C-alpha cells in the first residue's frame, strides 16, 4: 500500500467513483458498472486496534491522511440517541420506564452492574456492524480503502471482559455468542490490522492523560479488567485474525510517530498471497472473476437490510434482554412520538423540512 | 434473480421450458419441456455456502428425474397401444401418466419430498418451487379424464397437508404443507373447470407471492422470529398479518374469492361429499395459520430489547404493500372481474 510520498502526490482514482449513497447498486446495475475496475494497491481495509486509552483516533486520522484513505472512527451511542435532527433522546428518560431508560458509555462507567449494560454491549456490536458494511460499501464501490478505529470482530473481547468481571451472566454471554455466530460470517475479514501494544498500568496513566470525569471516578478501569482485555486480545483475537490479516504490533508507551508506521506498510508484499488460491491470508478478499466482485458488491450494497435483519433472533430465557410489554408500549408512545422521530427522517414537518407535498424519495440503506 | 445475471438467464430458460411444456400437443414435447425446466431449476436452489441447499437440490433432482422417466415410459406405452397422443377410453397407462405427474406436482401420497426438501431453501426459491413449478404438471393433468385417482389424490392432499402442518414450527415446512393443502383444492377444480383452476392458481400464487415478500425481506425462517420481529408501530404488524386470514379463506378478504369460486363450481357440478371433506381440511389450515397470527393479534409482546430499527429494501417493500392492500380489500374488485361468466 503506497503512501503519499512514494506516489509523488495525492492519490488518483483508477476510474470514476460510484455514488453509492445516492444511486442504488443492484443486479441490473451490475452489467454497466463493474467492481474491479476501481481496485488498486490502496483499496484495502486497515483496522487500527488497541486498549481503552492508546491514542487510536489521532493515529488513525494521521494514517488516513498519509495513505489517502477514508477515516472511520469508533461508533458511539450518540448515533442513535442523537438522531438526524440533532435531538438527543437522553432527555426522554423521565417519561420512559426504568427498564427502557437511556444507557450509554458513561452510564456503564457510573453503574457497571446494571442489566441493560449487557444490552449496551450487544448494541455496540450492532453499531460496529452498522459501520463495517459502511466500510465495505466504500472499498468496493469507490475503490478507496478505509481505516477503522475498531472492528466488529474486536467486540467479543469486551463481552468476555464484562463476563469475567461479573457484569454479565451466562445467558447474556450465550445470547451475544449466538448473535456473533449468526452475523459475523457474512463479513469480509480486514486486510491489515495495527495493534498498539500497551501495559496494564500505562493505559491507566493514559486515563490520567484524558482527565474526563466519568472515567476517573468509575470502578471498571482497574488492574484486573485491563489485564483481561490484554489477555483476551493477545491470546484469542489477534491470533484468530493473523491467519487472514497482516498483523502489525507496535509498542506505544511513548508518543510515537505515524510516519514509520506508514513506512512499515510498503515493506509488506501483498502479492505473495495470490500465488495460492487456497491461501488463508486474503482469502475473503480474492475473487477469480469480475462477476464475483459484482456479486460481493451487490451483497454489500443491496443487501444491507439483509445483514441488519439477520440480527432478528429470538432469545427469551434471559431477563436482562426482554422488554416488558406494558413498558414496550409506553416506550413506543414516548420514543416514536418524540420530536425528530415521528416519521421517517426525510419526511418530518416538525423539524422544518419543506416541500413534502411533491417529495417521493427515500434513502438507500436508511434506518426507518 | 439475486446477485447474478446468469440467474436472470436461468429464470428466462425456466419460463421458456414451462411454456414449452404446457403448449405441447404431444407428450414428448411436454416431456422435453420438463427436462428444460429441470435444467433451469437445478442451478437456482444450489449454493456452496449452504450445506443444506445442495441436499435440497439433490432431493429435487432425484424426485424429478424419477418422475420424468416414469412419465416418458407410460407416454411411450400410450403411443404403443392407442397410437394417437391421447386415449379414447381410460386405462392403466393413463393412471401411470397421472401418477408420474402427481410426483412432479407434490400431491399426496407422493408429497413426501416436498416439505422435507423445503427446509433447505431460501424464500424466493420456495416461491418459485410451489408456484411456477406447479404450472407444468398440473396443466398436464387436465388432459386425463380420471376421477378415482384424482379424487384419492385430492382427499389425501387435503387430509395430509392440513394435519402435517401442525407439528412444524419452521415457516418453510409449514408453508410447504400449506401448499400441499392448497394443491388439493387445485386438483379438485381440475376435473370440473380448467378456468376455475387457473383462477384458484392465480390467486393462490398471488397470496404466496405476497407472503413470501414479508418473509424474504425480514428473513423470518422460524415462528419465534415473527414474535421478535420489530415494527415501529404495532398497528402495522396487525395489518400485515391479515394475509394469513386471507389465505385461510376468511371473508371479506381476497382469498375467500378463489375458494368460493371453487365451491360454487363444485356444487354446480354435483360434488358435495369431497367438498365437505375439504371444509374440515381448511379449518386445520386456518388453525396453523393462526399460530403465526398470535404474533400480531395480542397487540403487545415481551420483545427483545437490543434491536431498535427495522430495515427493508426499497422496491421490494414498495411492491409488497401494493399487494397487501389487495389481499385485504380485494373483494371490492368483484364487479371488475369478467372471467367467471
Amino acid at each position: 500500500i503506497s503512501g503519499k510520498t512514494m506516489r509523488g502526490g495525492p492519490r488518483v482514482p483508477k476510474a470514476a467513483p460510484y455514488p453509492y449513497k445516492t444511486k442504488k447498486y443492484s443486479v441490473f446495475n451490475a452489467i454497466f458498472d463493474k467492481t474491479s475496475k476501481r481496485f488498486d494497491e490502496n483499496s484495502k481495509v486497515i483496522c487500527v486496534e488497541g486498549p481503552i486509552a492508546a491514542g487510536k483516533s489521532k493515529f488513525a486520522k494521521e494514517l488516513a491522511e498519509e495513505l489517502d484513505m477514508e477515516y472511520y472512527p469508533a461508533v458511539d451511542l450518540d448515533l442513535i440517541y442523537i438522531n438526524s435532527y440533532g435531538y438527543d433522546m437522553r432527555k426522554l428518560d423521565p417519561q420512559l420506564p426504568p427498564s427502557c431508560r437511556s444507557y450509554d458509555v458513561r452510564n456503564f462507567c457510573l453503574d457497571p452492574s446494571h442489566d441493560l449494560a449487557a444490552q449496551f454491549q450487544i448494541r455496540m456490536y450492532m453499531l460496529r456492524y452498522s459501520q463495517y458494511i459502511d466500510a465495505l460499501q466504500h472499498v468496493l464501490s469507490t475503490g478507496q480503502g478505509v481505516v477503522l478505529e475498531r472492528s466488529p470482530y474486536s467486540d467479543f473481547v469486551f463481552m468476555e471482559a464484562m463476563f469475567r468481571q461479573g457484569y454479565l451472566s451466562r445467558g447474556a454471554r450465550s445470547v451475544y455468542n449466538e448473535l456473533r455466530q449468526n452475523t459475523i460470517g457474512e463479513l469480509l475479514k480486514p486486510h491489515l490490522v495495527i495493534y498498539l501494544d500497551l501495559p496494564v498500568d500505562a493505559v491507566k496513566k493514559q486515563i490520567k492523560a484524558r482527565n474526563v470525569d466519568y472515567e476517573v471516578q468509575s470502578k471498571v478501569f482497574s488492574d484486573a479488567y485491563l489485564s483481561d482485555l490484554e489477555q483476551l486480545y493477545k491470546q484469542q483475537y489477534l491470533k484468530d485474525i493473523s491467519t487472514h490479516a497482516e498483523l502489525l504490533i507496535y509498542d506505544w508507551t511513548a508518543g510515537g510517530e505515524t510516519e514509520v508506521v506508514v513506512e512499515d506498510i510498503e515493506r509488506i508484499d501483498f502479492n505473495q498471497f495470490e500465488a495460492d488460491i487456497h491461501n488463508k491470508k486474503m482469502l475473503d478478499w480474492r475473487f477469480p472473476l469480475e462477476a464475483e466482485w459484482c456479486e460481493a458488491r451487490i451483497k454489500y450494497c443491496h443487501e444491507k437490510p439483509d445483514l441488519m435483519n439477520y440480527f432478528n433472533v429470538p432469545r427469551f430465557d434471559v431477563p436482562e434482554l426482554v422488554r416488558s410489554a406494558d413498558d414496550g408500549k409506553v416506550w413506543r408512545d414516548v420514543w416514536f412520538n418524540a420530536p425528530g422521530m415521528k416519521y421517517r427522517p426525510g419526511y418530518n414537518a416538525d423539524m422544518g423540512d419543506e416541500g413534502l407535498l411533491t417529495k417521493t424519495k427515500i434513502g438507500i440503506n436508511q434506518g426507518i | 434473480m439475486f446477485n447474478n445475471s446468469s440467474k436472470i438467464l436461468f429464470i428466462t430458460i425456466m419460463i421458456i421450458g414451462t411454456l414449452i411444456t404446457v403448449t405441447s400437443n404431444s407428450w414428448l414435447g411436454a416431456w422435453m419441456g420438463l427436462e428444460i425446466n429441470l435444467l433451469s431449476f437445478i442451478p437456482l436452489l444450489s449454493d456452496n455456502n449452504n450445506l443444506m441447499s445442495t441436499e435440497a437440490s439433490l432431493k429435487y433432482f432425484l424426485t424429478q428425474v424419477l418422475a420424468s422417466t416414469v412419465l416418458l415410459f407410460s407416454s411411450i406405452l400410450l403411443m404403443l397401444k392407442n397410437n394417437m397422443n391421447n386415449e379414447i377410453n381410460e386405462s392403466f397407462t393413463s393412471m401411470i401418466i397421472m401418477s408420474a405427474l402427481l410426483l412432479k406436482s407434490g400431491a399426496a401420497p407422493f408429497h413426501f419430498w416436498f416439505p422435507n426438501m423445503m427446509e433447505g431453501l431460501t424464500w424466493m426459491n420456495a416461491l418459485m418451487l410451489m408456484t411456477w413449478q406447479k404450472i407444468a404438471p398440473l396443466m398436464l393433468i387436465s388432459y386425463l379424464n380420471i376421477k378415482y385417482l384424482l379424487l384419492i389424490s385430492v382427499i389425501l392432499s387435503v387430509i395430509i397437508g392440513a394435519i402435517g402442518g401442525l407439528n412444524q414450527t419452521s415457516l418453510r415446512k409449514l408453508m410447504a404443507f400449506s401448499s400441499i393443502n392448497h394443491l388439493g383444492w387445485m386438483l379438485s377444480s381440475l376435473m370440473i373447470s380448467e378456468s376455475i383452476w387457473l383462477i384458484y392458481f392465480f390467486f393462490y400464487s398471488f397470496l404466496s407471492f405476497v407472503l413470501t415478500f414479508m418473509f424474504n425481506i425480514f428473513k423470518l425462517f422460524h415462528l419465534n422470529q415473527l414474535f421478535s420481529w420489530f415494527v415501529n408501530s404495532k398497528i402495522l404488524k396487525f395489518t400485515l398479518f391479515m394475509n394469513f386470514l386471507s389465505l385461510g379463506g376468511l371473508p371479506p378478504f381476497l382469498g375467500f374469492l378463489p375458494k368460493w369460486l371453487v365451491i360454487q363450481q363444485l356444487t354446480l357440478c354435483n360434488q358435495y361429499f369431497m367438498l365437505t371433506l375439504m371444509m374440515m381440511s381448511t379449518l386445520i389450515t386456518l388453525f396453523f395459520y393462526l399460530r403465526i397470527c398470535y404474533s400480531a393479534f395480542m397487540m403487545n409482546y415481551f420483545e427483545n430489547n437490543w434491536i431498535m430499527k427495522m430495515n427493508m429494501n426499497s422496491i421490494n417493500y414498495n411492491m409488497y404493500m401494493i399487494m397487501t392492500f389487495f389481499s385485504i380489500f380485494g373483494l371490492f374488485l368483484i364487479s371488475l372481474f369478467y372471467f367467471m361468466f
Binding site: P314, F316 | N224, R291, F302
Partner: peptide, 13 residues
Amino acid sequence: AKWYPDPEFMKQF
C-alpha cells in the same frame, strides 16, 4: 390489557 404474551408463551414454539 392486564395479561400479555410472556416468555412462557414464547417457549412452546
